[PDB]
């Protein structure tokens, strides 16, 4: 429906595996949004075409305030364009870097926001979203927005996905643990200098806490980071968790 001639392109906002995202404005309405540019040549030399277009026509039907919206899309001769919600306050990564680590209120708040977004995805049968801080954006009121493109790094993957086995909903509860830890500590709990070592650290579930992490947070993270998926909580139970309810908004 749309065309490139409909939009005025602005400053760059980020670069992903598949393309660059620019700030953009639609002329008729003056609507501010983000526009992504994917070269269909680059897509077909990695063999990723149509693998993603499934997710494109899925994302389209995912309306939730803690998930970045995909308004629509179109293609010219040599390229493909995605019209997406623009998140004013940038990535959670950029924010985590400035501050080093987040306090418990900000952290629990993001975990609540994440949980609701994931609980929503799971109701719509969408499983395993890549929620690295680099893929988390911040809306105008500092509200978290899940913004990934997957359907490299092991840091957020649970044992089952790295060890080849089948997985379910509860993958996303491991990730919440990894992120609850990374928000408070500043570094994910299984970080290492090599792929091969992170693999072991994740497999053997070898994480430790700095002195400053509270016993309530040690509890939640410990609950979320279980090798056996069955043992992990439900998202309801995470939102119910005392440490969360105490500090969250
Ligand atoms: C909706 C489905 C979707 C999700 C993610 C996608 N991939 C993206 S989005 C993106 C960046 C992006 C999208 C929307 N809003 C912002 N907001 C920002 C970013 C940076 C700054 C800043 O540093 O000053 C300020 N605001 C950034 C991206 O880089 N990729 C790969 C593509 C489609």
Question: If you had to describe this structure to a student in words, what would you say it looks like?
Answer:
The protein is α+β, with helices and mostly antiparallel strands and 249 residues long. The chain has two domains: 1-90, 2-Layer Sandwich (Phosphorylase Kinase, domain 1), CATH 3.30.200.20; 91-247, Orthogonal Bundle (Transferase(Phosphotransferase), domain 1). The chain contains ten helices and seven strands. It has a five-stranded antiparallel β-sheet. A two-stranded antiparallel ribbon has the order 6-7. Strand 2 and strand 3 form a beta hairpin. The chain is globular and about 55 Å long. It starts with 6 loop residues before the first strand and ends with a helix. It binds ligand 4RJ. It comes from Homo sapiens (Human). Residues 7-244 form the Protein kinase domain. ATP binds at residues 17, 36, 85-87, 134-135, 148.
What is the third-level CATH name, the topology of the largest domain?
Transferase(Phosphotransferase), domain 1
List bound small molecules: ligand 4RJ
Oligomeric state of this protein: monomer
Q: Given the structure, what is the number of helices?
A: 10
The CATH level-2 architecture of the largest domain is identified as Orthogonal Bundle
PDB class: transferase
Keywords: Aurora, kinase, inhibitor, transferase
Assembly: monomeric
Entry title: Human Aurora A catalytic domain bound to FK1141
């Amino acid at each position: 429906q749309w065309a490139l001639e409909d939009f005025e392109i602005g400053r760059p906002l980020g670069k992903g595996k598949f393309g660059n995202v620019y700030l953009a404005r639609e002329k008729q309405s003056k609507f501010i949004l983000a526009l992504k540019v994917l070269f269909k040549a680059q897509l077909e030399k990695a063999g990723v075409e149509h693998q993603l277009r499934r997710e494109v026509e899925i994302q389209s039907h995912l309306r939730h305030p803690n998930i970045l919206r995909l308004y629509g899309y179109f293609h010219d001769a040599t390229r493909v364009y995605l019209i997406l919600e623009y998140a004013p306050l940038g990535t959670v990564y950029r924010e985590l870097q400035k501050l080093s680590k987040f306090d418990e209120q900000r952290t629990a708040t993001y975990i609540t926001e994440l949980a609701n977004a994931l609980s929503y995805c799971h109701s719509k049968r969408v499983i395993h979203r890549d929620i690295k801080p680099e893929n988390l954006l911040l809306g105008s009121a500092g509200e978290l927005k899940i913004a990934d493109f997957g359907w490299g790094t092991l840091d957020y993957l649970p044992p089952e996905m790295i060890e080849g086995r089948m997985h379910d909903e509860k993958v996303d509860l491991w990730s919440l643990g990894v992120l609850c830890y990374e928000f408070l500590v500043g570094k994910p709990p299984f970080e290492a200098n090599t792929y091969q070592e992170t693999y072991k650290r994740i497999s053997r579930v070898e994480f430790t806490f700095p002195d400053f992490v509270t016993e309530g947070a040690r509890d939640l993270i410990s609950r979320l980071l279980k090798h056996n998926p069955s043992q992990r909580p439900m998202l309801r139970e995470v939102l119910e968790h005392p440490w969360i309810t105490a500090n969250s908004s």
